[PDB]
């Protein structure tokens, strides 16, 4: 029922999404590539120390600190989630293969029994309420741009200068590039200013993933990771298959004489759709302003920084419920779109804007290569743009598309099971804007703390708790969804945005406490997802621009760990055994490299003034930006370093687009 229609690279629909220059030539053929990754300058992630390396420290740590999660999913004691096998993968070599996109998620809905619309009145009240809150009084900021990111589509230009340029060509044209959309006339939008074409699909790691030790055989099992074929994918699951992709790491020998050692298996790979710049730019550019809104207005529900920013709100609740969502961008769905398109036309937004922001919600995906002898081709017409991918990852706004979604999908939760006497409060748009305006800033009996997917929810004293335990225990019993939105159930292990949620033997909110995740710590030293890019001069284009700092921030960060002491002298011990150094005085020593190296970017900073006025946030992200893409926002890193990786088009450009755009 409706086969997405596919091209080969070879044919002129695909042809038109790459301009004529080598990097765009480039970026179409580029086959299946693996190696392994620089874990830092001059270390190889498969080198026999380093893997010997975690060998034992992932035995030992799992051996002396098992998990300390209750039935209930609540983490107490050790500070533990799971067992430490996760850095035992060989970075830079990936499961093959990865899966195809799926075309249309309409079925995967259908079948998991998701609704395919609101419910009731309420519920669409409530999204609308949403739209309402969150897009209406926008104030113009200057759009931001990642240096050293690519426009893809047409162009793949990596050059600032370049990226500027068609960012203020795209504030200038998207007006009329939306009108000719709403005639229809995709290929002329695209054509005469690069606004449609495809997200460009490139397949990134998950460096660490699950594995266990089966007691009886003493052998190690990767969790299996299905994908789908081609088949599968462009007929939304109707043909094809869906299959385990292979982790097994054994072919690295035979193929590049790597040694692999017992339970080390290849990476888990995960889909990134880099999106057309010249249509990604005029969503941008009001996405921003917009999370200005929430993370200020609506702070309370929204803005996280801290482990005790997140502390204070939850500890005056009595109770907290750790949500998860199983596969959140595969099933957002295409009637929200919709939906939220059609209430900012009623807004008064501009009708051609709407149009290139729904459109950039229905693009077609270029398949680059997934695994060898595989990839190429492009799915769906962009002539007509009618896909249901669900969340594309680099559309201009997908934060807040799922953070629409989730957050009123957890009221709605919280409404249906625990309390039905709120919904006399929403009988139409002013009181359902009034409704979720209190909500949202944390003044009902029943609150939720979130950012897309990952959640908190509360009950304070009153009506709801009663209701607010029978859900938690729904949710244990996990036999019911609680949701007819998305597939809902307990995080195991409860955390919130990286910080794990400690309770003590109360098991309750207010005597519990946020503290790091331990195994992040292990993950980002020891199995980054990218390498150090030694070949990249400017570091500031690097994906991780300076790795050293980190240590300076490891006692900020993952300090009140119950076990935080142990696992560093854990790693100290086994580091010697490994490699016959310190490993304090080895990070040590790249962390005075790369303080030196800063100031060098850092225009505030001495040829060697000191790392004494960055915060604990401004080194991980120096570290590893890509944290400023789903932990943080430009608004908590200090200005003098959001200009290392950032640029900005001018304020009076976006000023000029924003007005264009908006009601009033
Ligand atoms: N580890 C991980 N998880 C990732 C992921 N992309 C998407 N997920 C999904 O997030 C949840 C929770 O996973 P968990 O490992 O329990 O905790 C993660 C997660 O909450 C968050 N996080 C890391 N990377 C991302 C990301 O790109 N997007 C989102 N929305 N959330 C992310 O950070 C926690 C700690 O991650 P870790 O210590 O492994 O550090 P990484 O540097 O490896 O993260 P990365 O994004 O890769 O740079 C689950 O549904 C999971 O499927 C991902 O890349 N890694
Ligand atoms: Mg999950
Ligand atoms: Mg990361
Ligand atoms: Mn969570």
């Not at 199995?527 to 006692?555: I, N, T």
Request: aromatic share 10%; hydrophobic share 40%; charged share 25%.
């Amino acid at each position: 029922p409706r086969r997405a229609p596919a091209f080969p690279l070879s044919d002129i629909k695909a042809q038109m999404l790459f301009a004529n220059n080598i990097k765009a030539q480039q970026a179409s053929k580029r086959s299946f590539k693996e190696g392994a990754i620089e874990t830092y300058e001059g270390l190889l992630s498969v080198d026999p120390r380093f893997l010997s390396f975690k060998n034992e420290l992932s035995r030992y740590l799992t051996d002396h600190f098992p998990a300390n999660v209750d039935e209930y999913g609540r983490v107490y004691g050790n500070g533990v989630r799971t067992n430490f096998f996760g850095m035992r993968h060989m970075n830079g070599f990936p499961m093959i293969p990865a899966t195809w996109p799926l075309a249309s998620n309409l079925k995967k809905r259908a079948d998991a029994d998701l609704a395919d619309g609101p419910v009731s009145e309420r519920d669409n009240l409530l999204f609308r309420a949403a739209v309402r809150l969150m897009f209406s009084d926008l104030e113009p900021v200057p759009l931001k741009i990642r240096k050293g990111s690519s426009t893809c589509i047409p162009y793949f230009s990596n050059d600032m200068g370049t990226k500027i340029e068609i960012a203020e060509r795209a504030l200038e044209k998207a007006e009329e590039a939306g009108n000719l959309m709403l005639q229809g006339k995709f290929d002329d939008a695209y054509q005469l200013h690069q606004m449609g074409g495809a997200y460009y699909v490139v397949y990134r790691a998950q460096s660490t993933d699950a594995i266990t030790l089966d007691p009886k055989t003493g052998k190690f099992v990767s969790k299996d990771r299905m994908v789908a074929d081609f088949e599968y994918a462009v007929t939304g699951g109707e043909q094809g298959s869906l299959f385990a992709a292979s982790k097994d790491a054994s072919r690295l020998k035979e193929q590049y004489g790597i040694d692999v050692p017992d339970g080390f298996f290849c990476e888990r790979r995960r889909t990134a759709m880099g999106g057309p710049f010249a249509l990604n730019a005029p969503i941008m550019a009001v996405a921003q302003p917009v999370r200005n809104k929430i993370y200020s207005k609506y702070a309370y529900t929204f803005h996280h920084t801290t482990r005790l920013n997140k502390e204070e709100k939850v500890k005056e609740w009595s109770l907290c419920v750790a949500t998860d969502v199983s596969d959140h961008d595969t099933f957002w769905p295409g009637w929200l779109r919709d939906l939220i398109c059609d209430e900012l036309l009623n807004m008064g937004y501009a009708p051609w804007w709407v149009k290139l922001f729904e459109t950039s919600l229905k693009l077609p995906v270029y398949v680059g290569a997934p695994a060898p002898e595989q990839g190429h081709t492009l799915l769906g017409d962009p002539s007509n743009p009618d896909l249901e991918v669900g969340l594309s990852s680099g559309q201009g706004a997908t934060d807040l598309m799922g953070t629409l979604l989730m957050s009123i999908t957890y009221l709605v939760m919280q409404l249906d099971h625990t309390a039905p006497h709120l919904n006399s409060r929403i009988k139409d748009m002013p009181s359902a804007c009034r409704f979720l305006d209190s909500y949202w800033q944390g003044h009902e009996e029943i609150r939720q703390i979130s950012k897309s997917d990952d959640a908190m929810l509360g009950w304070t004293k009153g009506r709801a708790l009663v209701g607010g335990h029978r859900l938690f225990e729904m949710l244990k019993e996990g036999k019911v969804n609680p949701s007819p939105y998305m597939k809902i159930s307990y995080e195991h292990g409860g955390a919130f945005l990286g910080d794990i949620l400690l309770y003590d033997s109360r098991r309750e909110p207010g005597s519990a406490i946020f503290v790091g995740n331990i195994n992040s710590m292990l993950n980002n030293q020891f199995s980054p997802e990218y390498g150090v890019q030694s070949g990249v001069r400017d570091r500031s284009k690097r994906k991780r621009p300076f790795p050293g700092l980190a240590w300076a921030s490891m006692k900020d960060t993952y300090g009140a760990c119950p076990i935080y002491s142990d696992v560093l002298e854990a790693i100290e011990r086994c580091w010697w055994n490994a490699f016959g150094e310190s490993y304090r005085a080895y990070r040590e020593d790249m962390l005075k490299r790369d303080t030196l190296e800063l100031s060098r970017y850092v225009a505030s900073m001495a040829r060697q003034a000191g790392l004494a006025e960055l915060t604990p946030i401004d080194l991980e992200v120096l570290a590893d930006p890509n944290k400023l893409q789903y932990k943080w926002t430009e608004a908590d890193v200090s200005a003098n370093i959001h200009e290392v990786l950032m640029h900005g088009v001018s304020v009076e450009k976006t000023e000029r687009f924003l007005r264009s755009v908006m009601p009033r």
